[PDB]
Symmetry: D2
Subunit: 229 residues, 4 copies
């Protein structure tokens, strides 16, 4: 029915699974708990940070126990411990000072041996590149008016995402992509109401995407803590 | 709508147009004249070779004048002159000895300065790679039962196509791809009956395909005559 | 050995050859005539526009006859004809208003049926991408301090180059790349002094680059009048 | 220097590191122990299977304690445990019935939760594609006479390697590549003796190769039990 929640969310969890560390999980920007519900299958100790009281309240009404909720902007958040897994998915592109957020993650929140799961929408996704060729988007890394209205301040590609992670002091351990994406979201949502594409086709786009990270819907950096003093 | 006739044929002509030489044209394997109809817009002197007397007669009914029709197998064909442009589109994959056919083109049929437009379906098309990931097709360069039934003896990729052209003595001048293809024909044929995709989307697939020749529906080598004695 | 002059120049002429129109040719930013010497093998009617008096003087004393020299800035150039082939190679990335120059080319200088051969250094060249992974360059389309000191005001990729061409009103007919480049120029200049790489290897890099336009040393748009 | 030993080995361990399971490790086709010595930094409980008496003897001489050595062919090997990590690196391409070896791994040797690190030389490596363009090698997935003399029976790419792992009953969890490789081993060995390329350049090739798995020196499937 819905591309981001019914297709992308499940494949994002699948992409993270082989890298998850045992222990606890911090979900930054957990919004209404839609992704949290999927992570609860893997983690019994999840902390969620979200600035919207309303989103957080919605989450709290639909998730199982074992979640610690923190209603705060990231700059103001005082967390009680450090975390073995941290999830920052489709959040960084909303942040005015992304390097500062990533640096907090590296310096304050990641446990020793902990891993950051950094995922952003990808400037070089096939569907976007086609939109650029059609002249609907000026260029790949452009921020469209709709994206700006949604809160985006940039459109990452693997090059600029790893730059920001490196500038923050993180160690980028793995680079990958999630879901080979040749149609726009609005076309997916139409086509998914039909029997034209199978579940197996969607799995094939996930499998093939790993071979063409630069062309995927979302790009994925697995990062570990770097030493900063 | 039909993908091959309504989408691929016009993009093939667009892909050829910047390279056409002044003079005449030989269309090898012209079948029922579906492609010949588009070539007529560019050339007044066209020669078609085709083994099926029914196809050739079908073509003769529908096309305009200014076509010389040669009813023959390629190995038997005795042509009255040499040709400034030679078109071999979706034919070589059907040939038991493709190097021998290409060698005839080089040695007997290409005029001095003439160009061969060699186009084959691509083993590495994104849609085919997805089918391979789904387990429908064993590997990219496999020939499926249905393909074999249609007459295919090979599934070329840029490496194996250039190999055969080189072995035939041709000079490969340009390598490219036609149409960034991430859906199968059967899905195109369904979706093209909807309004999900626009004509501009399809144009975008053609534009982007040029930047990713290996992932296109068909691959295209522009070849010139080499010296063989 | 120079990578740009001894490797990139011949491969650019090879990439252009199948697209050349019969007729005349205009070379915009012809500098000291290094690339003009190679174009002279294909055309006997060449017009060269160059702003540097020393450069164009140097070309003049070095090239064969059949050349019209125009010592002018592009904004001031009064050309006597329009042109069947126009070459703009490693110039656009220096231009403060690149769309304005491309528009002049579309609207005034290209002949009907004419072709523009637009080539720029590629942000996404493998060598550059590696430099970016090393932390030497911030990101692919960055302009470094050295590049800026050389006059670069942007680092094009296929997306931004076609954007600017399209904004100028040109028709982008073909998109390609010239030379699969995994080493930096300075490493090439060194390595070319040795016997490690062959001329066949270099030809192979050219042939392979056509299959990976986004990863090449230079990107190449073939444009026609919109 | 050696390219395979001094460059590829360390970058294979790096590629593996984020996927390693706690516990033990089985190295299939451990030869003279060059890769094993690197694995010893990560695991104290390693089991090595190697058919050559000379090779396995050499390894015992040069490695630390905490290695179990199994001098056997794969078809005869009777292993004492099942394993959390199994390494099969540059071996499968030599095996007459590769699906049968992968099935043994899936059905008998992998522990539940265990991971197979399957790595083969890549048909579509840039250097190899250049060699194909030069006419030295017929096509990317060919086996050359020299390769065949060295025991190669195929040249895998991502599509065929995943096909074979899938046919064996393995779950292919991740697909990646190791080292963006645009020069031939023999060119690397020469250039490595010079100062033209730094270790940071080589790290850059590793980092970039993850973004272009199909162009890498070797391809890497991380598999689990199906
Ligand atoms: Cl800085
Ligand atoms: Cl073949
Ligand atoms: Cl005109
Ligand atoms: Cl600057
Ligand atoms: Cl077990
Ligand atoms: Na300027
Ligand atoms: Na064998």
């Amino acid at each position: 029915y819905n591309f981001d929640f019914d297709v992308m969310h499940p494949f994002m969890v699948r992409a993270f699974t082989p890298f998850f560390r045992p222990g606890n999980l911090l979900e930054l920007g957990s919004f209404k708990g839609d992704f949290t519900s999927r992570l609860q299958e893997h983690f019994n100790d999840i902390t969620c940070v979200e600035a919207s009281e309303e989103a957080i309240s919605h989450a709290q009404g639909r998730l199982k126990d074992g979640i610690t909720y923190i209603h705060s902007r990231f700059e103001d958040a005082q967390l009680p411990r450090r975390y073995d897994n941290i999830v920052l998915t489709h959040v960084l592109e909303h942040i005015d000072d992304p390097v500062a957020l990533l640096k907090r993650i590296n310096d304050d929140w990641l446990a020793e041996g902990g891993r950051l799961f950094l995922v952003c929408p990808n400037a070089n996704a096939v569907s976007r590149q086609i939109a650029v060729k059609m002249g609907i988007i000026s260029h790949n890394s452009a921020v469209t008016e709709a994206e700006f209205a949604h809160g985006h301040r940039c459109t990452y590609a693997l090059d600029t995402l790893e730059r920001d992670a490196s500038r923050a002091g993180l160690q980028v351990t793995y680079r990958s992509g999630i879901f080979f994406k040749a149609l726009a979201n609005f076309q997916w949502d139409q086509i998914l109401q039909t029997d034209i594409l199978s579940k197996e086709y969607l799995d094939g786009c996930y499998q093939l995407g790993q071979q063409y990270p630069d062309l995927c819907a979302s790009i994925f950096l697995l990062c570990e803590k770097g030493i900063n003093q």
